[PDB]
Design an enzyme around this catalytic site. Structure first.
Site, mmCIF file in Angstrom:
data_model
loop_
_atom_site.group_PDB
_atom_site.id
_atom_site.type_symbol
_atom_site.label_atom_id
_atom_site.label_comp_id
_atom_site.label_asym_id
_atom_site.label_seq_id
_atom_site.Cartn_x
_atom_site.Cartn_y
_atom_site.Cartn_z
ATOM 1 N N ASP A 202 0.867 -1.170 0.000
ATOM 2 C CA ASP A 202 0.000 0.000 0.000
ATOM 3 C C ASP A 202 0.911 1.229 0.000
ATOM 4 O O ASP A 202 1.899 1.277 0.735
ATOM 5 C CB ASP A 202 -0.916 -0.005 1.230
ATOM 6 N N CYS B 233 -7.985 -2.438 -4.918
ATOM 7 C CA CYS B 233 -6.854 -2.608 -4.023
ATOM 8 C C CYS B 233 -7.518 -2.423 -2.661
ATOM 9 O O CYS B 233 -8.555 -3.035 -2.412
ATOM 10 C CB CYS B 233 -5.760 -1.558 -4.301
ATOM 11 N N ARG C 76 -3.082 2.100 -5.937
ATOM 12 C CA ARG C 76 -2.604 1.037 -6.810
ATOM 13 C C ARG C 76 -3.499 0.830 -8.037
ATOM 14 O O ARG C 76 -3.003 0.660 -9.160
ATOM 15 C CB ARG C 76 -2.470 -0.254 -5.994
ATOM 16 N N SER C 77 -4.811 0.866 -7.837
ATOM 17 C CA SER C 77 -5.735 0.679 -8.957
ATOM 18 C C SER C 77 -5.624 1.851 -9.930
ATOM 19 O O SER C 77 -5.735 1.672 -11.144
ATOM 20 C CB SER C 77 -7.174 0.530 -8.444
#
Ligand SMILES: NC(=O)[C@@H](CS)NC(=O)CCCCCNC(=O)[C@H](Cc1ccc(C(F)(F)P(=O)(O)O)cc1)NC(=O)[C@@H](CC(=O)O)NC(=O)Cc1ccc(C(F)(F)P(=O)(O)O)cc1
Ligand SMILES: [Mg+2]
Ligand SMILES: [Mg+2]
EC number: 3.1.3.48
Length: 297
Positions: A180, A214, A220-221
Protein backbone atom coordinates in the site's frame (compact mmCIF):
# COMPACT_ATOMS: atom_id res chain seq x y z
CA UNK A 1 8.06 13.29 -25.21
CA UNK A 2 7.44 11.58 -21.87
CA UNK A 3 10.89 10.04 -22.18
CA UNK A 4 12.55 13.46 -22.06
CA UNK A 5 9.91 14.81 -19.67
CA UNK A 6 10.64 11.97 -17.24
CA UNK A 7 14.37 12.67 -17.54
CA UNK A 8 14.06 16.39 -16.76
CA UNK A 9 11.63 15.76 -13.90
CA UNK A 10 13.90 13.06 -12.50
CA UNK A 11 17.13 15.09 -12.82
CA UNK A 12 15.68 18.16 -11.11
CA UNK A 13 13.98 16.07 -8.44
CA UNK A 14 10.58 17.62 -9.06
CA UNK A 15 8.24 14.62 -8.83
CA UNK A 16 6.71 16.07 -5.67
CA UNK A 17 5.98 19.29 -7.59
CA UNK A 18 4.22 17.62 -10.52
CA UNK A 19 2.25 15.33 -8.21
CA UNK A 20 1.12 18.19 -5.96
CA UNK A 21 0.07 20.14 -9.05
CA UNK A 22 -2.07 17.17 -10.07
CA UNK A 23 -3.70 17.01 -6.62
CA UNK A 24 -4.30 20.75 -6.80
CA UNK A 25 -5.98 20.65 -10.19
CA UNK A 26 -7.91 17.40 -9.61
CA UNK A 27 -11.68 17.63 -10.05
CA UNK A 28 -13.97 18.05 -7.04
CA UNK A 29 -17.47 16.54 -7.30
CA UNK A 30 -20.12 15.71 -4.69
CA UNK A 31 -20.27 12.30 -2.98
CA UNK A 32 -23.63 12.81 -1.27
CA UNK A 33 -24.88 9.24 -1.67
CA UNK A 34 -21.69 7.76 -0.17
CA UNK A 35 -21.87 10.09 2.85
CA UNK A 36 -25.49 9.18 3.70
CA UNK A 37 -25.66 7.78 7.27
CA UNK A 38 -27.22 4.52 6.07
CA UNK A 39 -24.17 3.92 3.84
CA UNK A 40 -21.54 4.36 6.53
CA UNK A 41 -20.90 0.62 6.91
CA UNK A 42 -20.48 0.21 3.14
CA UNK A 43 -17.37 2.41 3.01
CA UNK A 44 -14.03 1.08 4.20
CA UNK A 45 -12.62 4.60 4.61
CA UNK A 46 -14.21 7.91 5.61
CA UNK A 47 -11.96 9.86 3.24
CA UNK A 48 -12.49 7.69 0.15
CA UNK A 49 -15.83 7.92 -1.65
CA UNK A 50 -17.08 7.64 -5.24
CA UNK A 51 -18.49 10.76 -6.93
CA UNK A 52 -22.29 10.66 -7.31
CA UNK A 53 -22.16 11.19 -11.07
CA UNK A 54 -19.90 8.21 -11.80
CA UNK A 55 -20.76 5.73 -9.04
CA UNK A 56 -21.92 2.23 -9.94
CA UNK A 57 -25.49 1.56 -8.86
CA UNK A 58 -26.52 -1.89 -7.70
CA UNK A 59 -29.71 -3.06 -9.41
CA UNK A 60 -31.74 -3.44 -6.23
CA UNK A 61 -34.56 -1.64 -4.41
CA UNK A 62 -33.24 -1.77 -0.83
CA UNK A 63 -29.97 0.13 -1.27
CA UNK A 64 -28.16 0.61 -4.58
CA UNK A 65 -24.96 1.88 -2.97
CA UNK A 66 -21.50 0.40 -3.42
CA UNK A 67 -18.18 2.25 -3.15
CA UNK A 68 -17.31 1.85 -6.83
CA UNK A 69 -16.79 4.21 -9.75
CA UNK A 70 -17.05 3.84 -13.51
CA UNK A 71 -14.00 5.31 -15.23
CA UNK A 72 -14.94 5.85 -18.87
CA UNK A 73 -12.00 6.77 -21.09
CA UNK A 74 -13.59 8.07 -24.29
CA UNK A 75 -10.54 8.46 -26.54
CA UNK A 76 -8.94 5.22 -25.38
CA UNK A 77 -12.34 3.52 -25.79
CA UNK A 78 -12.07 1.59 -22.52
CA UNK A 79 -13.97 1.70 -19.24
CA UNK A 80 -12.89 0.43 -15.82
CA UNK A 81 -14.68 -0.03 -12.52
CA UNK A 82 -12.51 1.05 -9.59
CA UNK A 83 -13.70 -0.06 -6.17
CA UNK A 84 -12.51 -0.59 -2.60
CA UNK A 85 -11.53 -3.99 -1.25
CA UNK A 86 -14.85 -5.63 -0.27
CA UNK A 87 -15.88 -5.48 3.40
CA UNK A 88 -17.30 -8.49 5.30
CA UNK A 89 -20.77 -7.03 4.68
CA UNK A 90 -20.32 -5.92 1.04
CA UNK A 91 -18.96 -9.13 -0.51
CA UNK A 92 -22.41 -9.95 -1.86
CA UNK A 93 -22.79 -6.42 -3.22
CA UNK A 94 -19.38 -6.71 -4.90
CA UNK A 95 -20.29 -9.89 -6.75
CA UNK A 96 -23.74 -8.45 -7.53
CA UNK A 97 -21.92 -5.60 -9.26
CA UNK A 98 -19.67 -7.97 -11.21
CA UNK A 99 -22.77 -9.83 -12.41
CA UNK A 100 -24.89 -6.78 -13.28
CA UNK A 101 -22.05 -4.95 -15.06
CA UNK A 102 -21.20 -8.13 -17.00
CA UNK A 103 -17.51 -8.01 -16.07
CA UNK A 104 -15.24 -10.84 -17.23
CA UNK A 105 -12.29 -10.06 -14.99
CA UNK A 106 -11.43 -8.77 -11.53
CA UNK A 107 -7.98 -7.26 -10.89
CA UNK A 108 -6.85 -7.27 -7.24
CA UNK A 109 -3.72 -5.32 -6.33
CA UNK A 110 -3.68 -5.66 -2.54
CA UNK A 111 -3.51 -8.49 -0.02
CA UNK A 112 -6.26 -9.57 2.38
CA UNK A 113 -3.68 -9.15 5.15
CA UNK A 114 -1.54 -6.02 4.83
CA UNK A 115 0.95 -4.82 7.45
CA UNK A 116 -1.03 -6.84 9.99
CA UNK A 117 -4.38 -5.11 9.49
CA UNK A 118 -6.94 -6.63 7.12
CA UNK A 119 -7.27 -4.22 4.19
CA UNK A 120 -9.74 -6.57 2.51
CA UNK A 121 -12.15 -9.46 3.17
CA UNK A 122 -11.65 -12.96 1.73
CA UNK A 123 -14.33 -12.59 -0.96
CA UNK A 124 -13.43 -15.60 -3.14
CA UNK A 125 -13.06 -19.34 -2.32
CA UNK A 126 -9.61 -20.64 -1.41
CA UNK A 127 -10.57 -24.27 -2.08
CA UNK A 128 -12.48 -25.95 -4.91
CA UNK A 129 -14.59 -28.02 -2.52
CA UNK A 130 -15.64 -25.00 -0.44
CA UNK A 131 -17.79 -22.77 -2.63
CA UNK A 132 -19.22 -19.51 -1.33
CA UNK A 133 -22.86 -18.50 -1.20
CA UNK A 134 -23.82 -14.85 -0.86
CA UNK A 135 -27.32 -15.07 0.59
CA UNK A 136 -28.14 -11.36 0.48
CA UNK A 137 -27.58 -11.17 -3.28
CA UNK A 138 -28.39 -14.81 -4.09
CA UNK A 139 -25.11 -15.61 -5.86
CA UNK A 140 -22.79 -18.62 -5.72
CA UNK A 141 -19.04 -18.50 -6.29
CA UNK A 142 -16.78 -21.48 -6.94
CA UNK A 143 -13.02 -21.74 -7.39
CA UNK A 144 -12.43 -23.71 -10.60
CA UNK A 145 -8.63 -23.49 -10.77
CA UNK A 146 -5.69 -21.27 -9.86
CA UNK A 147 -2.23 -20.68 -11.28
CA UNK A 148 0.13 -19.40 -8.61
CA UNK A 149 3.20 -17.41 -9.65
CA UNK A 150 5.95 -15.79 -7.59
CA UNK A 151 4.30 -12.36 -7.38
CA UNK A 152 0.74 -12.91 -8.65
CA UNK A 153 -1.99 -15.54 -8.96
CA UNK A 154 -4.56 -16.08 -11.71
CA UNK A 155 -7.78 -17.80 -10.66
CA UNK A 156 -10.64 -19.14 -12.70
CA UNK A 157 -13.96 -18.74 -10.90
CA UNK A 158 -17.55 -19.65 -11.69
CA UNK A 159 -20.20 -17.14 -10.69
CA UNK A 160 -23.79 -18.34 -10.64
CA UNK A 161 -26.93 -16.24 -10.31
CA UNK A 162 -28.95 -18.59 -8.09
CA UNK A 163 -32.19 -16.97 -9.25
CA UNK A 164 -31.81 -17.86 -12.93
CA UNK A 165 -29.16 -20.56 -12.45
CA UNK A 166 -27.18 -19.01 -15.30
CA UNK A 167 -23.41 -19.14 -14.75
CA UNK A 168 -20.37 -17.14 -15.87
CA UNK A 169 -16.61 -17.66 -15.78
CA UNK A 170 -14.74 -14.86 -14.02
CA UNK A 171 -10.96 -14.50 -14.19
CA UNK A 172 -9.28 -13.21 -11.03
CA UNK A 173 -5.86 -11.57 -11.46
CA UNK A 174 -4.24 -11.04 -8.08
CA UNK A 175 -0.99 -9.05 -7.83
CA UNK A 176 0.32 -10.22 -4.46
CA UNK A 177 3.47 -8.12 -3.95
CA UNK A 178 2.32 -4.51 -4.36
CA UNK A 179 2.51 -2.69 -0.96
CA UNK A 180 0.00 0.00 0.00
CA UNK A 181 1.36 3.43 -0.98
CA UNK A 182 4.17 1.48 -2.65
CA UNK A 183 5.16 0.44 -6.16
CA UNK A 184 5.69 -2.83 -8.09
CA UNK A 185 9.15 -4.44 -7.95
CA UNK A 186 9.83 -3.33 -11.52
CA UNK A 187 8.19 -2.02 -14.71
CA UNK A 188 8.79 -5.49 -16.16
CA UNK A 189 6.88 -7.37 -13.47
CA UNK A 190 4.02 -4.87 -13.63
CA UNK A 191 3.89 -4.94 -17.44
CA UNK A 192 4.03 -8.75 -17.46
CA UNK A 193 0.97 -8.72 -15.19
CA UNK A 194 -0.90 -6.11 -17.21
CA UNK A 195 -0.34 -7.93 -20.50
CA UNK A 196 -1.49 -11.19 -18.92
CA UNK A 197 -4.78 -9.42 -18.13
CA UNK A 198 -5.01 -8.04 -21.66
CA UNK A 199 -4.32 -11.42 -23.30
CA UNK A 200 -7.00 -13.13 -21.22
CA UNK A 201 -9.53 -11.07 -23.14
CA UNK A 202 -10.91 -9.66 -19.88
CA UNK A 203 -10.41 -6.09 -21.13
CA UNK A 204 -12.25 -6.66 -24.41
CA UNK A 205 -15.09 -4.23 -25.25
CA UNK A 206 -17.38 -7.22 -25.80
CA UNK A 207 -17.40 -7.72 -22.03
CA UNK A 208 -18.45 -5.31 -19.30
CA UNK A 209 -15.76 -3.11 -17.66
CA UNK A 210 -13.00 -4.88 -15.77
CA UNK A 211 -13.26 -4.51 -12.00
CA UNK A 212 -10.03 -3.19 -10.49
CA UNK A 213 -9.46 -2.87 -6.75
CA UNK A 214 -6.85 -2.61 -4.02
CA UNK A 215 -7.64 -1.42 -0.49
CA UNK A 216 -9.09 2.04 -1.14
CA UNK A 217 -9.36 1.56 -4.89
CA UNK A 218 -7.38 4.69 -5.78
CA UNK A 219 -3.63 4.35 -5.30
CA UNK A 220 -2.60 1.04 -6.81
CA UNK A 221 -5.73 0.68 -8.96
CA UNK A 222 -5.24 4.21 -10.27
CA UNK A 223 -1.67 3.36 -11.27
CA UNK A 224 -2.81 0.18 -13.02
CA UNK A 225 -5.52 1.83 -15.13
CA UNK A 226 -3.47 4.95 -15.92
CA UNK A 227 -0.69 2.82 -17.41
CA UNK A 228 -3.13 0.69 -19.41
CA UNK A 229 -5.03 3.71 -20.75
CA UNK A 230 -1.81 5.52 -21.73
CA UNK A 231 -0.47 2.48 -23.61
CA UNK A 232 -3.83 2.18 -25.33
CA UNK A 233 -3.66 5.85 -26.38
CA UNK A 234 -0.11 5.56 -27.76
CA UNK A 235 -1.31 2.68 -29.91
CA UNK A 236 -4.28 4.65 -31.27
CA UNK A 237 -2.80 8.08 -32.00
CA UNK A 238 -0.78 8.78 -35.14
CA UNK A 239 1.75 10.26 -32.73
CA UNK A 240 2.65 8.05 -29.71
CA UNK A 241 4.59 10.96 -28.19
CA UNK A 242 1.47 13.10 -27.91
CA UNK A 243 0.35 11.23 -24.79
CA UNK A 244 0.43 13.56 -21.77
CA UNK A 245 0.27 11.17 -18.80
CA UNK A 246 -0.45 14.07 -16.42
CA UNK A 247 -3.41 15.03 -18.59
CA UNK A 248 -4.67 11.45 -18.79
CA UNK A 249 -4.53 11.09 -15.00
CA UNK A 250 -6.56 14.28 -14.46
CA UNK A 251 -9.16 13.03 -16.95
CA UNK A 252 -9.36 9.80 -14.95
CA UNK A 253 -9.69 11.80 -11.71
CA UNK A 254 -12.93 13.30 -13.04
CA UNK A 255 -14.49 9.88 -12.38
CA UNK A 256 -12.91 8.87 -9.07
CA UNK A 257 -10.90 10.79 -6.48
CA UNK A 258 -7.24 10.39 -5.56
CA UNK A 259 -6.13 8.10 -8.37
CA UNK A 260 -2.40 7.47 -7.76
CA UNK A 261 -1.50 8.24 -4.14
CA UNK A 262 2.24 9.06 -4.12
CA UNK A 263 4.77 10.97 -6.20
CA UNK A 264 6.68 7.73 -6.56
CA UNK A 265 3.61 5.90 -7.91
CA UNK A 266 3.39 8.68 -10.50
CA UNK A 267 7.08 8.26 -11.37
CA UNK A 268 6.55 4.51 -11.73
CA UNK A 269 3.57 5.10 -14.02
CA UNK A 270 5.89 7.00 -16.38
CA UNK A 271 8.39 4.14 -16.28
CA UNK A 272 5.74 1.53 -17.01
CA UNK A 273 4.38 3.53 -19.95
CA UNK A 274 7.87 4.29 -21.30
CA UNK A 275 8.95 0.64 -21.12
CA UNK A 276 5.59 -0.60 -22.38
CA UNK A 277 5.80 1.72 -25.38
CA UNK A 278 8.71 -0.40 -26.62
CA UNK A 279 6.27 -3.27 -27.19
CA UNK A 280 3.59 -1.07 -28.74
CA UNK A 281 6.03 0.47 -31.22
CA UNK A 282 6.87 -2.95 -32.60
CA UNK A 283 9.68 -5.11 -31.22
CA UNK A 284 7.52 -7.86 -29.70
CA UNK A 285 10.68 -9.23 -28.09
CA UNK A 286 10.26 -7.19 -24.90
CA UNK A 287 7.10 -9.21 -24.25
CA UNK A 288 9.00 -12.39 -23.35
CA UNK A 289 11.72 -10.18 -21.87
CA UNK A 290 9.42 -8.92 -19.11
CA UNK A 291 8.35 -12.48 -18.36
CA UNK A 292 12.00 -13.36 -17.75
CA UNK A 293 12.79 -10.21 -15.76
CA UNK A 294 9.71 -10.69 -13.56
CA UNK A 295 10.88 -14.19 -12.57
CA UNK A 296 7.43 -15.80 -12.30
CA UNK A 297 7.05 -18.86 -10.06
C1 LIG B 1 -6.95 11.30 -1.28
C2 LIG B 1 -6.95 11.11 0.29
C3 LIG B 1 -5.71 10.23 0.75
C4 LIG B 1 -5.73 10.06 2.34
C5 LIG B 1 -4.88 8.71 2.76
N1 LIG B 1 -5.71 8.15 3.96
C6 LIG B 1 -5.50 6.92 4.57
O1 LIG B 1 -4.48 6.20 4.01
C7 LIG B 1 -6.79 6.03 4.50
C8 LIG B 1 -7.34 5.60 3.12
C9 LIG B 1 -6.60 4.92 2.24
C10 LIG B 1 -6.07 3.58 2.49
C11 LIG B 1 -5.21 2.89 1.47
C12 LIG B 1 -4.92 3.68 0.13
C13 LIG B 1 -4.01 3.08 -0.99
F1 LIG B 1 -3.46 4.12 -1.70
F2 LIG B 1 -3.01 2.38 -0.30
P1 LIG B 1 -4.81 2.03 -2.20
O2 LIG B 1 -5.88 2.89 -2.89
O3 LIG B 1 -3.73 1.58 -3.17
O4 LIG B 1 -5.48 0.80 -1.55
C14 LIG B 1 -5.54 5.15 -0.09
C15 LIG B 1 -6.34 5.72 0.95
N2 LIG B 1 -7.71 6.73 5.38
C16 LIG B 1 -7.68 6.48 6.69
O5 LIG B 1 -7.00 5.73 7.31
C17 LIG B 1 -8.65 7.41 7.37
C18 LIG B 1 -8.67 8.92 7.09
C19 LIG B 1 -9.58 9.90 7.76
O6 LIG B 1 -10.77 9.94 7.32
O7 LIG B 1 -9.14 10.62 8.69
N3 LIG B 1 -9.49 6.70 8.33
C20 LIG B 1 -10.72 6.27 8.09
O8 LIG B 1 -11.10 5.81 7.04
C21 LIG B 1 -11.20 5.40 9.40
C22 LIG B 1 -12.37 5.95 9.81
C23 LIG B 1 -12.29 7.15 10.79
C24 LIG B 1 -13.57 7.80 11.28
C25 LIG B 1 -14.99 7.28 10.80
C26 LIG B 1 -16.37 7.97 11.31
F3 LIG B 1 -16.17 9.37 11.23
F4 LIG B 1 -17.36 7.70 10.34
P2 LIG B 1 -16.79 7.22 12.89
O9 LIG B 1 -15.69 7.50 14.07
O10 LIG B 1 -18.12 7.91 13.32
O11 LIG B 1 -17.02 5.54 12.82
C27 LIG B 1 -15.03 6.02 9.77
C28 LIG B 1 -13.74 5.37 9.29
MG1 LIG C 1 -7.16 -29.46 -2.40
MG1 LIG D 1 -6.50 -27.28 -10.86
Amino acid sequence: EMEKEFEQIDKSGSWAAIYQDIRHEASDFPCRVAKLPKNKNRNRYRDVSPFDHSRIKLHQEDNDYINASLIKMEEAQRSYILTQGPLPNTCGHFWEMVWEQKSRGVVMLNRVMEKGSLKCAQYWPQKEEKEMIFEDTNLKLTLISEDIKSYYTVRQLELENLTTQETREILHFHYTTWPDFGVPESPASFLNFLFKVRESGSLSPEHGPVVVHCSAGIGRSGTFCLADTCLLLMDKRKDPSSVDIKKVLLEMRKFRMGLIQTADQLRFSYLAVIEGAKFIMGDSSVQDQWKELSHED
